[PDB]
Amino acid sequence: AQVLEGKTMGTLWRVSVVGIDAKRAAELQTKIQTQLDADDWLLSTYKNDSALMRFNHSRSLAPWPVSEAMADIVTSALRIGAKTDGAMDITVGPLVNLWGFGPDRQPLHIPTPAQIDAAKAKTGLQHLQVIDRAGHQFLQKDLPDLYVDLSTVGEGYAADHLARLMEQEGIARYLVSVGGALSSRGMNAQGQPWRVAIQKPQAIVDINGHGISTSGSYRNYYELDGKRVSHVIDPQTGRPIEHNLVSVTVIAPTALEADGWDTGLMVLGTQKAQEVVRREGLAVFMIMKEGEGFKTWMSPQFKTFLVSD
Amino acid sequence: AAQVLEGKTMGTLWRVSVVGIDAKRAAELQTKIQTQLDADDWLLSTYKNDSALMRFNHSRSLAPWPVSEAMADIVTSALRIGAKTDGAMDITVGPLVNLWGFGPDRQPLHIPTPAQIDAAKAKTGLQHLQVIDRAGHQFLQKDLPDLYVDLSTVGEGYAADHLARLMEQEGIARYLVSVGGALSSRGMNAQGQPWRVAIQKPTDRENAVQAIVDINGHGISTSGSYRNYYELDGKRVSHVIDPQTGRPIEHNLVSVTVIAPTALEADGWDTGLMVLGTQKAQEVVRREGLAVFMIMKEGEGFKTWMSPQFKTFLVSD
Ligand SMILES: Cc1cc2nc3c(=O)[nH]c(=O)nc-3n(C[C@H](O)[C@H](O)[C@H](O)COP(=O)(O)OP(=O)(O)OC[C@H]3O[C@@H](n4cnc5c(N)ncnc54)[C@H](O)[C@@H]3O)c2cc1C
Ligand SMILES: Cc1cc2nc3c(=O)[nH]c(=O)nc-3n(C[C@H](O)[C@H](O)[C@H](O)COP(=O)(O)OP(=O)(O)OC[C@H]3O[C@@H](n4cnc5c(N)ncnc54)[C@H](O)[C@@H]3O)c2cc1C
């Protein structure tokens, strides 16, 4: 099994494949990096000349020409936005910028309630549109202020796009990983399905043909005996989320959707997250704070992906 | 150990083969497969007036027309294939399909006049249709009231992909699904080997030979029939229309088989390539660069061509 590692999107990517030799794996390293750089140059909020950031810097309310991938990513992210009751909101940009959770200048003082209200007045899923045509795709906003942030959906795409690259290179047996987003196919070098482990206050899943993603870290919470001020923002309040929910793991058809649902479920909190998961029948595992210890919950749909042996 | 299921949908046949479940659950899967295919039929059919597509076609509103997520993505995929085939496969070719009587419509009393053809193809065009995607809502939009969208060459492909999604949904990772000419597969046989899709090659004397491919994780679709050509000693006036001439295609290209990431794309591409013809198709296939197998007529016999990308899918055992 040839393993490859590198850096993309301010984080790490990992690819493992079975079927090719060391020389062919070194050539795959270059092809992977090239594609991930292109995905970075398409979606990054940290690069002013990226395709998204060019759209964000534009004040135009007219249709804004984009690639097929960009249109499909935003479309996918808008749909998750509606299914999470607006919890996962890609227009949360101005709020992200206000608290200084992106590339921009750190706030001199803690944002006032007025500053918070003014910033979320620039947010809204209603304000963004995708227009698909024969040989042309467009993003459209009805508010010049609108600032789109695809951070919670980018790694997921990168992982899924990396899986397709694996396919067109003729490789059927693989594990692809970008950040916390992961996707898998076929058997590893030892004839077993790829081993994705999830930390329990350890469970092993088989997610071949699916995507997995985790938001939050129990491992960090246990070590640091506490939690960062969250970089995940609740669109309803305009403030960082304040929940006892520590970590959320989602198994979905694509890694992009797994990545998107992660944040949405974190925004909703334990009770509302479980309710939407039951209603829409999703594969979700979550860790929450319980006094001085922890409690775990996994949906019936999540249980089906566990490996017994 | 393989459970095999068959039935009818969309005026053609569907086949599903599944490893990993018993007979009692395969029977239950039959019901779930049929229900979903009936729904897909009720979404995409041109032969059913109360279908979602036909409701859009009978509407002359130029404002955004509310459709399902699937409908929006199907059309999005179809328009893109339209552009990448240089307009060859055109989902707005409806009016012309209806004029020649290739759809559900009443058979023409006389052969279409050059003027009738011009008037019909003035109601066609890829630039006349767009898709609008929003949070919680999707829309189709036309700028021409007479526009008629026909998704015949993309429906079976979608149905095959949607069926493959249901297999994953039911926890089945070892399957072969097909609707009409479109097909998709995953995993191993009951004998523990990749699903074997057979593609007919021309016969030399007495030895009938065919190529075997592994298309696991991909979609495959064949347009045209070599066996029918060989037996009948010729082909019928084609139901595939060239949107440029407004006429049935008269090419020596007998059959086209495409392997693509999805069955919908394979379904959409083989019509586009059939419209383009041998030379033009081969040029696109090399530049694109697609996984294609084609059979063309060569006088009394036939010859075959397959792209380098197609050859990678061949099983060498
Ligand atoms: C294309 C791309 C390029 C990147 N480039 C860089 C880089 O150059 N340098 C760098 O340091 N990091 C970069 N990142 C960030 C990268 O994802 C890192 O892995 C990240 O810093 C670590 O993850 P996280 O803990 O911030 O969680 P994340 O997965 O990044 O989630 C937190 C982020 O989600 C967004 N968010 C907050 N609330 C919501 C909401 N309610 N709905 C939707 N989204 C919300 C915010 O932007 C927040 O920063 C990039 C990300 C992408 C997708
Ligand atoms: C959703 C759905 C429902 C159907 N319901 C019925 C039914 O109820 N009864 C029935 O008899 N048949 C029905 N059909 C068709 C059926 O599936 C058969 O497979 C088909 O009639 C036989 O295949 P064919 O030879 O026409 O090839 P096809 O794959 O059907 O391709 C030919 C068809 O494509 C269309 N076409 C022609 N030129 C172009 C062009 N250049 N660009 C794009 N498209 C073009 C035409 O409509 C033509 O009929 C349905 C098809 C679909 C997708």
- List % helix, strand, coil for chain A (3-state, nearest 5): 40, 25, 35
- Pairwise CA distance, residues B33 & B178, whole Å: 11
- Pairwise CA distance, residues B33 & B35, whole Å: 6
Token pair for A198: 């999830």
In the DSSP assignment, the letter for residue B214 is -
Handedness of CA B67, B70, B71, B77 (dihedral sign): positive
Secondary structure (DSSP) of B239-265 = S-EETTTTEE---SEEEEEEEESSHHH
CA of A66 to nearest chain B CA: how many angstroms apart?
Answer: 14
Token pair for A83: 């299914």
At A174, is the secondary structure helix, strand, or coil?
Answer: strand
How far is the CA of A103 from the CAs of A93, A254, B222, in angstroms?
A: 11, 28, 50
Neighbouring residues of B72: CB distance < 8 A, sequence distance ≥ 6: A132, B131, B132, B133, B138, B139, B140
Q: Mapped to the 3 state alphabet, what secondary structure does A243-296 carry?
A: CCEEEEEEEECCHHHHHHHHHHHHHHHHHHHHHHHHHHCCEEEEEEEECCEEEE
- Pairwise CA distance, residues A260 & A253, whole Å: 12
Q: How far from chain centre, in Å, is Cα B17?
A: 20
- Pairwise CA distance, residues A20 & B163, whole Å: 32
- Pairwise CA distance, residues B310 & B230, whole Å: 24
The amino acid that residue A299 corresponds to is S
A130 neighbors B134 (Cβ within 8 angstroms): yes
Domain with B62, as residue range(s), is: 1-317
How far is the CA of A212 from the CAs of A133, A266, B186, B271, in angstroms?
A: 31, 15, 20, 37
Domain of residue B119, CATH code: 3.10.520.10
CA of A284 to nearest chain B CA: how many angstroms apart?
Answer: 15
CA of B153 to the centre of ligand 2 (A): 6
Q: Kindly state the helix (H) or strand (E) to which residue A223 belongs, with its residue range.
A: helix A218-224
Secondary structure (DSSP) of A1-39 = -EEEEEEETTEEEEEEEESS-HHHHHHHHHHHHHHHHHH
A150 neighbors A52 (Cβ within 8 angstroms): yes
- Pairwise CA distance, residues A126 & B254, whole Å: 50
- Pairwise CA distance, residues B205 & A282, whole Å: 57
Chain A residue with Cα closest to B91: A134
Is A9 marked as a binding-site residue? yes
The amino acid that residue A17 corresponds to is V
The finding on whether B222 has its CB within 6 A of some atom of ligand 2 is: no
Rounded to 10 degrees, the C-alpha dihedral B191/B14/B249/B54 comes to: -150
Q: Kindly state the helix (H) or strand (E) to which residue B151 belongs, with its residue range.
A: none
Contact status of B290 with chain A (Cβ, < 8 Å): no
Q: Kindly state the helix (H) or strand (E) to which residue B297 belongs, with its residue range.
A: strand B291-298
- Pairwise CA distance, residues A55 & A254, whole Å: 26
Contact status of A126 with chain B (Cβ, < 8 Å): yes
Which residues from chain A sit within 8 angstroms of residue B134, using beta carbons? Answer: 78, 126, 128-130
- What are the backbone angles phi and psi of residue A72, rounded to the nearest 5°? -65, -35
A146 neighbors A139 (Cβ within 8 angstroms): no
- Pairwise CA distance, residues A193 & B174, whole Å: 14
- What are the backbone angles phi and psi of residue A50, rounded to the nearest 5°? -70, 160
At A214, is the secondary structure helix, strand, or coil?
Answer: strand
- What are the backbone angles phi and psi of residue A178, rounded to the nearest 5°? -130, 110
- What are the backbone angles phi and psi of residue B59, rounded to the nearest 5°? -85, 140
How far is the CA of A259 from the CAs of A117, A208, A246, B58, B255, in angstroms?
A: 27, 16, 16, 40, 42
B198 neighbors B215 (Cβ within 8 angstroms): no
How far is the CA of A126 from the CAs of A144, A298, B8, B40, B131, in angstroms?
A: 13, 32, 42, 29, 17
- The number of distinct structural domains making up chain B is 1
Token pair for B102: 């290739």
Which residues from chain B sit within 8 angstroms of residue A79, using beta carbons? Answer: 69, 133, 135-136
Neighbouring residues of A294: CB distance < 8 A, sequence distance ≥ 6: A201, A218, A246, A287, A288
Closest by CA position to A11, among listed A221, A209, A150, A158: A158
At B280, is the secondary structure helix, strand, or coil?
Answer: helix
In the DSSP assignment, the letter for residue A106 is P
Helix pair angle (B23-44, B152-169), 10° resolution: 150
Is A89 marked as a binding-site residue? yes
A253 neighbors B168 (Cβ within 8 angstroms): yes
Nearest to B133 among A78, A134, A210 (CB): A78
B176 neighbors B16 (Cβ within 8 angstroms): yes
- Pairwise CA distance, residues A128 & A146, whole Å: 8
Handedness of CA A232, A235, A236, A238 (dihedral sign): positive
- Pairwise CA distance, residues A234 & A156, whole Å: 21
At B125, is the secondary structure helix, strand, or coil?
Answer: coil
- What are the backbone angles phi and psi of residue B50, rounded to the nearest 5°? -90, 15
Q: How far from chain centre, in Å, is Cα A89?
A: 12
Token pair for B5: 């299921």
Q: Do B134 and A210 touch (CB under 8 A)?
A: no
In the DSSP assignment, the letter for residue B107 is P
Which residues from chain B sit within 8 angstroms of residue A78, using beta carbons? Answer: 133-136
Is B47 marked as a binding-site residue? yes
Token pair 């698909």 is at which residue? A132
Strand-by-strand arrangement of the A173-178 sheet: A2-8, A11-18, A173-178, A181-185, A211-215, A245-252, A283-290, A293-298
Q: Do A132 and B136 touch (CB under 8 A)?
A: no
A179 neighbors A30 (Cβ within 8 angstroms): no
Q: Kindly state the helix (H) or strand (E) to which residue A210 belongs, with its residue range.
A: none
- The stretches of chain B forming alpha helices (DSSP H) are 23-44, 52-57, 69-84, 94-100, 114-121, 152-169, 226-232, 263-276, 278-288, 308-311
- Pairwise CA distance, residues A89 & A123, whole Å: 8
